[model samples]
Target: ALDAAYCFRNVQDNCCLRPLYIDFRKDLGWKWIHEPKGYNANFCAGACPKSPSCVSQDLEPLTIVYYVGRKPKVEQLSNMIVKSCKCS
Candidate 1:
């Protein structure tokens, strides 16, 4: 699911979601990256620290957040992709 978002974020024309992966804590999007498969919340921060692919936004006290309502189907997932960097 995280990869799904990453791919969507890159291909997205409006906004970049990379910073969100490394920052943004309001949507609880970190949940999508951390707890997608189960309730077990393994530490992603540690993993991110070790990860060679992790590119942070350089935000102090940066956080990843996600917002959830319902289980996302493929269509919904595709639609949930970044529509804009700035909300208009």
Candidate 2:
């Protein structure tokens, strides 16, 4: 198995799990956006500044990479995981 690193969805479907780097100050500014219940078979993942919210983490580098598919249906790889990060 490709378990060398973090692979929430190690391998599957045609979708890249793109990495999204955001600044808790500049990018998000400690903001919280609304994320609807959605699922993108293409690519799916998310994070939060809380433990019991859309995002489930404390504080650290998201260090992520897109597990993209051969033929991504979305226009961009990042789009595959829609709000993988705390859009809100």
Candidate 3:
């Protein structure tokens, strides 16, 4: 799964497991920001810099796409993942 690829549970399962998406509960007033994909600072830094974090590994070109859906069935797909899942 893509989320697992990033050392975490796949996003598909994450989103799919959600029972109550947004109840607009005052207790949970903070908005949920899903930064699906894009160029992350750490991603670029680790890829470019030859540091402890940097390792000889496959580094692909980074890109980020964003979208939203009101319906739970609707999935937003893009090249980018949160925190740039495919980081070095």
Candidate 4:
């Protein structure tokens, strides 16, 4: 499911954070130059019952090394994963 739904009485409901596991080598068939090939790429997965929408509150950087041609290159990326979630 894309989002998780919950019910409440006489209360405002909003989006929240959820755990999502991402596997690069196994799931995506990617080749990693480093050791870690999997991580928890958290996502927003809750319904905004009375608000606008669900979005990511906080994001973190992820540094990874992968193959491009015959060599491996490292990349420093921002907003690679969600650290928190909220309602907009």
Cα lDDT of all candidates, in order?
A: 0.30, 0.31, 0.29, 0.65
Which order, best to worst by lDDT? 4, 2, 1, 3
Ranking by TM-score: 4, 2, 3, 1
Model 4 per-residue lDDT tens digits across residues 1-88: 1322321222233466566788887887876545467776777755776456778777888888777686778887688787766667
Candidate 3 lDDT: 0.29
Lowest-scoring 10 consecutive residues by lDDT in candidate 2?
A: 33-42
Q: Pick the candidate with the highest TM-score.
A: 4
* Candidate 1: tens digits of C-alpha lDDT, residues 1-88: 2332453445543223332332223344444543233221211111222224332231222122334566442312222322222221
Q: Which candidate should be chosen as best, given lDDT against the real structure? A: 4
RMSD of each candidate relative to the true structure: 14.4, 15.7, 12.2, 6.8
Give the winner by lDDT: 1 or 3: 1
What local lDDT does model 1 show for residue 79? 22
TM-score of 3: 0.19
Decide which is better by TM-score, 1 or 4: 4
Better of 1 and 3 by TM-score: 3
* Per-prediction TM-score: 0.16, 0.22, 0.19, 0.63
Tens digit of per-residue lDDT, candidate 3, span 1-88: 2222443343332121111122222334534333322223222122322333322233233332323564323344343223332223
lDDT score, candidate 4, position 53: 76
